[PDB]
Amino acid sequence: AQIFPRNANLLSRLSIFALVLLVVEGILILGVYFRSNYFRQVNVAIEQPVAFSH
Amino acid sequence: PFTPQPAPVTGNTYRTYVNDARTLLNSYGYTMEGKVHIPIDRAMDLIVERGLPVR
Numbered sequence: 448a449q450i451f452p453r454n455a456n457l458l459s460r461l462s463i464f465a466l467v468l469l470v471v472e473g474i475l476i477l478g479v480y481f482r483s484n485y486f487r488q489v490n491v492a493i494e495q496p497v498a499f500s501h
Numbered sequence: 502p503f504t505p506q507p508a509p510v511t512g513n514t515y516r517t518y519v520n521d522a523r524t525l526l527n528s529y530g531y532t533m534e535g536k537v538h539i540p541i542d543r544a545m546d547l548i549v550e551r552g553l554p555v556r
Contacts, residue, residue, distance in 0.1 A: 484502040491502050 484490050530538045539547065 489502065490504050492505060
């Protein structure tokens with residue numbers, strides 16, 4: 448009350464919650480990127496110099 | 502990147518030729534000029550029994 452305003456308690460609790468969610472989202476983004484079809488070149492028609500038709 | 506969906510083949514394929522040849526190679530039958538069919542796993546046995554010239 449001397450320094451911090453009224454909503455500082457809710458702001459600090461929401462900051463802890465958002466930091467935990469941000470850590471989880473970063474781990475999730477790293478895992479999805481290392482398992483993604485773009486990274487692993489999956490389900491993409493890789494272009495050939497002749498475009499041979501199987 | 503989803504799994505691609507190619508367009509289906511809308512024309513004549515090799516399957517008609519393969520199925521017609523496999524039907525003609527079985528269940529005996531007659532040609533247009535010759536005498537009679539001899540099917541697969543029969544004419545190979547006749548070839549083995551009658552032999553082939555060697556050297």
